[PDB]
Amino acid sequence: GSYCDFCLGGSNMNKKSGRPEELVSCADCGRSGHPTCLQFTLNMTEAVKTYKWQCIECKSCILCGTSENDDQLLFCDDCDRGYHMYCLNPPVAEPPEGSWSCHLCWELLKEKAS
Amino acid sequence: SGRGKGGKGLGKGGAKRHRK
Ligand SMILES: [Zn+2]
Ligand SMILES: [Zn+2]
Ligand SMILES: [Zn+2]
Ligand SMILES: [Zn+2]
């Protein structure tokens, strides 16, 4: 049994606010979290509740999934796919170190169109 | 988010979050 590392309630409850939502546990730790307390975006929120929202610590790359440098890892808070900013297709050096979307989301982004 | 327990951190502000 997990819960938001920020309220420790239970998704349908934001305990610290007693309001409903939907946590996100780490597919490694189990540490759940409300995307509201996580500052996530919808797409993230929706993507992280279904697949492995490896807690930001286990987050690592997706282009490596090793954490390697983790000083470049770009955390797509649109699902949680970190990419050492020099792993991306348009690799950055600093630019969107935190936010920024990933490629799976993008190809899926463009796919969302039409 | 913003990584759990494991130290004190590396930042002293409030900008950006979630990394490790
Ligand atoms: Zn919460
Ligand atoms: Zn974890
Ligand atoms: Zn990488
Ligand atoms: Zn993504």
Closest CA to A79 of A101, A62, A108: A101
Q: In this structure, are residues A66 and A73 in contact, taking their beta carbons and an 8 Å threshold?
A: no
Q: In this structure, are residues A73 and A83 in contact, taking their beta carbons and an 8 Å threshold?
A: yes
Residue-by-residue DSSP string for B1-20: ----SSSS-S-SS-S-----
Q: A28 to chain B, minimum CA–CA distance in Å?
A: 13
**A84 Cβ under 8 Å from any chain B Cβ:** no
Q: In this structure, are residues A99 and A73 in contact, taking their beta carbons and an 8 Å threshold?
A: no
**Partner residue facing A38 (CB), from B1, B4, B6:** B1
Kindly identify which residue of chain A lies nearest to residue B2, measuring between CA atoms.
A56
Q: Which CATH number fits domain A1-114: 2.40.30.10, 3.30.40.10, 3.40.50.720, 1.50.10.20?
A: 3.30.40.10
CB contact under 8 A, B17 and A39: yes
- Solved using: NMR
**B16 Cβ under 8 Å from any chain A Cβ:** yes
Domain ranges of chain A: 1-114
Kindly identify which residue of chain A lies nearest to residue B16, measuring between CA atoms.
A98
Q: Could you give the CA distance from residue A77 to residue B17 in angstroms, rounded to a whole number? A: 10
- Give residues with Cβ within 8 angstroms of A16, minimum separation 6: A6, A7, A9, A37
Closest CA to A73 of B7, B4, B5, B16: B16
**B14 Cβ under 8 Å from any chain A Cβ:** no
